[PDB]
Scaffold this active site. Structure first.
Site, mmCIF file in Angstrom:
data_model
loop_
_atom_site.group_PDB
_atom_site.id
_atom_site.type_symbol
_atom_site.label_atom_id
_atom_site.label_comp_id
_atom_site.label_asym_id
_atom_site.label_seq_id
_atom_site.Cartn_x
_atom_site.Cartn_y
_atom_site.Cartn_z
ATOM 1 N N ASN A 125 5.560 -0.837 6.908
ATOM 2 C CA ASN A 125 4.924 0.178 6.078
ATOM 3 C C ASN A 125 4.235 1.212 6.982
ATOM 4 O O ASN A 125 3.400 0.873 7.843
ATOM 5 C CB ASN A 125 3.945 -0.505 5.106
ATOM 6 C CG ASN A 125 3.222 0.482 4.177
ATOM 7 O OD1 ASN A 125 3.266 1.695 4.363
ATOM 8 N ND2 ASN A 125 2.525 -0.056 3.186
ATOM 9 N N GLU A 129 2.340 -10.214 3.208
ATOM 10 C CA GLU A 129 3.170 -9.779 4.333
ATOM 11 C C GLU A 129 3.989 -10.915 4.908
ATOM 12 O O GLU A 129 3.466 -11.997 5.207
ATOM 13 C CB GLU A 129 2.340 -9.080 5.435
ATOM 14 C CG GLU A 129 1.780 -7.716 5.019
ATOM 15 C CD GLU A 129 1.027 -6.988 6.137
ATOM 16 O OE1 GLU A 129 0.754 -7.605 7.184
ATOM 17 O OE2 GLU A 129 0.713 -5.787 5.965
ATOM 18 N N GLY A 174 -1.334 -5.848 0.370
ATOM 19 C CA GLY A 174 -0.227 -6.677 -0.087
ATOM 20 C C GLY A 174 0.196 -7.812 0.839
ATOM 21 O O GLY A 174 -0.024 -7.779 2.060
ATOM 22 N N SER A 219 0.804 -1.185 0.000
ATOM 23 C CA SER A 219 0.000 0.000 0.000
ATOM 24 C C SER A 219 0.843 1.241 0.000
ATOM 25 O O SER A 219 1.961 1.244 0.431
ATOM 26 C CB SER A 219 -1.036 0.022 1.135
ATOM 27 O OG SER A 219 -0.460 0.057 2.403
ATOM 28 N N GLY A 220 0.263 2.278 -0.563
ATOM 29 C CA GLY A 220 0.826 3.589 -0.553
ATOM 30 C C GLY A 220 0.196 4.494 -1.580
ATOM 31 O O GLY A 220 -0.792 4.172 -2.201
ATOM 32 N N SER A 241 -0.071 1.588 5.940
ATOM 33 C CA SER A 241 -0.547 0.323 5.396
ATOM 34 C C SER A 241 -2.052 0.176 5.573
ATOM 35 O O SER A 241 -2.574 0.369 6.672
ATOM 36 C CB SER A 241 0.187 -0.833 6.062
ATOM 37 O OG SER A 241 -0.318 -2.079 5.647
ATOM 38 N N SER A 242 -2.721 -0.168 4.475
ATOM 39 C CA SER A 242 -4.144 -0.495 4.437
ATOM 40 C C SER A 242 -4.400 -1.811 5.150
ATOM 41 O O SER A 242 -3.835 -2.832 4.781
ATOM 42 C CB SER A 242 -4.608 -0.624 2.971
ATOM 43 O OG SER A 242 -4.621 0.636 2.306
ATOM 44 N N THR A 294 -3.076 4.016 -4.719
ATOM 45 C CA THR A 294 -4.158 4.996 -4.716
ATOM 46 C C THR A 294 -4.165 5.774 -6.021
ATOM 47 O O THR A 294 -5.224 6.065 -6.577
ATOM 48 C CB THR A 294 -4.023 6.008 -3.545
ATOM 49 O OG1 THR A 294 -4.108 5.309 -2.303
ATOM 50 C CG2 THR A 294 -5.133 7.044 -3.589
#
Ligand SMILES: [Mg+2]
Lengths: 734, 147
Positions: free
Chosen positions: A156, A383, A381, A106-107, A159-160, A111
């Site tokens: 992260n 992990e 993502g 994520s990042g 992170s989502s 987005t």
């Protein structure tokens, strides 16, 4: 007919299927080469990899939309617009629902890819204000959902901890009807516990950092991370992250997407309540659990207009079901703590759902008219941390499921093509996601099922009894490992106690069993729900509609594992009933720097994404294929026979060209409509020959021009030579 | 030698038209110009070969019988109208039979034995009949191969 090809002026390998030899080092070097030349997009067949540039590339112009729109995938150099053109046209011309799945870490890059797709679609559908109103709502509500659903992990900073689906919906005419956001898999357990080095969700830190003294006083919150059990002071600071500023940004996004000031405030009162619940402690009595200190509870109940006597009883007594003579079960201390935690994390996840539902209101289709949609599915993502817990297990399981159906479908489609072209299939060796998924999700002997069984059984239960049950049941599985399960003298580090290892498509993952039992406990029983429903606080009441006496009580799911499993099924249904495309996002470094490229990190991500297996399954037997006509056209200058206008049928020309170039007949095969080339070496030999011949064709033109120029002038001189030779000579005379 | 008497006379006329000094020789620098004036289309490489053979004694001059030797080499060679046409079509990404002066500039200035800036400048103008809507190379080649 267009002669432009992705092969033209290709920086490195533009489609990874043409990488040779295929390995991690060549994959990573290729991505680094293209990135170093400002190429952030790279293909795997139709799949788009996107490496985040960390700077604004001028490659998303109206002109660039005009370039890629209505054009074949292979005609232009790699770009996300190619994928979105593909999806838009399938929607427009086939009336097919589209789902573009976006995987990876994520990042800001993930987005942005989603925003690029939605904005391309809005631009290209030509519906103006109606489509942009939906698009704006989806896009502007992103920082709101980040605040509530994202967190800093050890890996992260942003992170989502959930999956998000977004779409723009149309009627079959192409008229926009609305849109939707759907959340999945919110990591509720983070509300009440976080691993060392990690934070709870952003919003808690944003609130205590950015709220005014007067606001915090109204929320009955103290401005001190050490006062809240649910937050640690230790990891409270994220470097380069200003939680106060973000608080203001989140409040502003709230207003932008239509939240009123009272609503915004109501939301923060729920966050405060969630936070204060974490300070409630319990002690045993002689009736075996009692709250230690009633102060937090009192302040929560004043904040929320909840009956303190009732809420307190809800933590310590559970109403058992009719029809037996016993009405109330006494909760012990452990059960009271589970209750406190179940209340906090469900109040929180319901707040999160409420937010999404609120945002959805202004873009709701509100017509029963049949619709077709353009969707983006963003899944968190893969992990692999130092300490992998329940949280990683659910995330990796979800990623495993998706890789499964993706690899299956890519394999099935490569086969259907080979058959249409009458080309022989060669068996492809690939990792079997299916059995890993089965190990995890099997109802009779899977890990989730065993965790559930352990949590519900009446004996003494620990993470150890859980592990011991896995060792008994899952030891037959080839891909399950634990200290007490197996094994071949192959230099493996010995597995510690209290853990188990799983071979995932992304690599082996070692899971610590510590906390599995706790985190699987998620029972929000009726007494809790009814206490909440009776709150004078409008938002909270609305968050627990099952607590209304007018709504009949149903059996409450007692564990998290089963809900997450059903939620994974839900999002898969969503994906599988639509036409899929794929964007694989990669972070090039962790410093968020514009040119800096770390091959180490990219290597981990390559593995998380399962790209190499994608390449192999997609390349399959023959790396390249092309219709005979365009193939001949592109390479007819190579042999001095096809040049400049033959041979015969396009197929005939191909054969004779390959014969004259002394290309061995094992390097290619003749399809029903396309030439098929096995190895990318062949293709590149052709390409290097063409590039040389284009240098010759340039000379042909150049020599013809220099020739015609002199010839013309010479003919001029010859025409006037009588005058020229008369002026050199006198007028007169003898 | 294989040249016919009429060819010899035709080449002689051109040879003399570029014999400024009247010594019955021409310079090596004028070699290409005279060859091209007579309707042959040598590359800069081929030109360098012929000079390398005749200026292996270091004089920079060429006389008529060694000029006839030079003209004789490419005598049987020919490039079709269609070859030159298809060579254009290759640098055209559409099938329209048209190519942009920007693109044409690109190919001439970067590929092959490159055209000079003044040459590529001059090329556009002859090629841009409907000025300055870009070149219909079909017509340009038609005119170029016009014999
Ligand atoms: Mg009820």
């Amino acid at each position: 007919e267009v002669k432009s090809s992705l092969l033209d002026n290709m920086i490195g390998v533009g489609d990874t299927v043409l990488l040779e030899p295929l390995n991690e080092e060549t994959f990573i070097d290729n991505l680094k080469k293209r990135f170093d030349h400002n190429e952030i997009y790279t293909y795997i067949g139709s799949v788009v990899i996107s490496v985040n540039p960390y700077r604004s590339l001028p490659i998303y112009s109206p002109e660039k939309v005009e370039d890629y729109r209505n054009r074949n995938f292979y005609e232009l150099s790699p770009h996300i617009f190619a994928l979105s053109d593909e999806a838009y046209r399938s929607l427009r011309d086939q009336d097919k629902d589209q789902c573009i799945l976006i995987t990876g870490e994520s990042g800001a890059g993930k987005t942005e890819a989603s925003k690029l797709v939605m904005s391309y679609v809005a631009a290209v559908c030509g519906k103006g204000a109606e489509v942009n109103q939906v698009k704006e709502q989806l896009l502007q509500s992103t920082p709101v959902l980040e605040a509530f659903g994202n967190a800093k992990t050890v890996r992260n900073d942003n992170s989502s901890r959930f999956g998000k689906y977004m779409d723009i919906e149309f009627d079959f005419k192409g008229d926009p009807l609305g849109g939707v956001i759907s959340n999945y898999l919110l990591e509720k357990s983070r509300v009440v516990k976080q691993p060392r080095g990690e934070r709870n969700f952003h919003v808690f830190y944003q609130l205590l950092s950015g709220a005014s003294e007067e606001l915090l006083h109204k929320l009955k919150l103290e401005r001190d991370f050490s006062r809240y059990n649910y937050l640690s002071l230790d990891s409270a600071k994220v470097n380069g992250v200003d939680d106060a500023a973000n608080f203001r940004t989140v409040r502003n996004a709230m207003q932008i997407v239509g939240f009123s000031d009272p609503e915004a405030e109501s939301v923060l009162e729920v966050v405060a309540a969630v936070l204060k619940l974490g300070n409630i402690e319990f002690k045993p009595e002689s009736d075996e659990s009692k709250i230690k200190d009633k102060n937090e509870l009192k302040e929560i109940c004043e904040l929320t207009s909840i009956d303190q006597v009732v809420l307190e009883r809800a933590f310590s007594f559970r109403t058992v079901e009719a029809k037996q003579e016993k009405v109330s079960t006494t909760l012990n201390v452990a059960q009271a703590y589970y209750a406190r935690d179940a209340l906090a994390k469900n109040l929180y996840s319901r707040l999160f759902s409420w937010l999404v539902n609120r945002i959805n209101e202004s873009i709701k289709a509100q017509t029963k008219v049949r619709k077709k949609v353009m969707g983006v599915l963003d899944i968190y993502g893969f992990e692999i941390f130092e300490d992998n817990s329940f949280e990683q297990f659910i995330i990796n399981y979800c990623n495993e499921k998706l890789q499964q159906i993706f690899i299956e479908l890519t394999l099935k489609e490569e086969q259907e093509e080979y058959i249409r072209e009458d080309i022989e299939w060669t068996h492809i060796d690939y990792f079997n996601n299916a059995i890993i998924c089965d190990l995890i999700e099997n109802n009779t002997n899977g890990i989730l099922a065993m965790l559930d069984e352990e949590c519900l059984r009446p004996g003494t239960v620990t993470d150890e009894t859980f592990l011991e049950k896995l060792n008994q049941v899952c030891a037959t599985h080839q891909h399950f490992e634990s200290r007490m399960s197996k094994c071949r003298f192959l230099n493996d580090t010995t597995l510690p106690h209290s853990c188990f290892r799983i071979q995932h498509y992304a690599g082996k993952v070692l899971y610590q069993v510590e906390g599995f039992v706790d985190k699987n406990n998620d029972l929000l029983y009726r007494d809790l729900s009814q206490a909440m429903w009776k709150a004078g606080h409008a938002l909270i009441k609305s968050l627990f509609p099952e607590g209304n006496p007018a709504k009949v009580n149903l059996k409450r799911p007692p564990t998290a594992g089963s809900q997450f499993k059903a939620s994974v099924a839900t999002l898969m249904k969503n994906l599988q009933t639509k036409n899929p495309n794929y964007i694989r996002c990669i972070k090039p470094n962790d410093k968020k720097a514009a040119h800096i490229f770390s091959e180490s990190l990219v290597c981990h991500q390559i593995r998380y994404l399962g790209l190499l297996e994608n390449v192999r399954v997609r390349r399959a037997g023959y790396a390249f294929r092309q219709a005979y006509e365009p193939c001949l056209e592109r390479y007819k200058m190579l042999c001095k026979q096809t040049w400049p206008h033959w041979k015969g049928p396009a197929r005939s020309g191909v054969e004779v060209l390959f014969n004259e170039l002394e290309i061995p007949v094992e390097e290619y095969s003749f399809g029903r409509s396309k030439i098929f080339i096995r190895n990318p070496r062949t293709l590149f030999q052709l390409e290097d020959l063409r590039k040389q011949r284009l240098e010759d064709l340039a000379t042909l033109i150049q020599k013809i021009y220099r020739g015609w120029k002199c010839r013309t002038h010479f003919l001029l001189m010859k025409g006037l030579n009588d005058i020229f030779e008369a002026q050199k000579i006198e007028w007169h005379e003898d | 030698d294989q040249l016919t008497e009429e060819q010899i006379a035709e080449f002689k006329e051109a040879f003399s038209l570029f014999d400024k000094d009247g010594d019955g020789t021409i310079t090596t620098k004028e070699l290409g110009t005279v060859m091209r004036s007579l309707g042959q289309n040598p590359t800069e490489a081929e030109l360098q070969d012929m000079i390398n053979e005749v200026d292996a004694d270091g004089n920079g001059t060429i006389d008529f019988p060694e000029f006839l030797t030079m003209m004789a080499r490419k005598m049987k060679d020919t490039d079709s109208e269609e070859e030159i046409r298809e060579a254009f079509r290759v640098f055209d990404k559409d099938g329209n039979g048209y190519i942009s002066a920007a693109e044409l500039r690109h190919v001439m200035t970067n590929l092959g034995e490159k055209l000079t800036d003044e040459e590529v400048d001059e090329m556009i103008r002859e090629a841009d009949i409907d000025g300055d809507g870009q070149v219909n190379y079909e017509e340009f080649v038609q005119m170029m191969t016009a014999k």
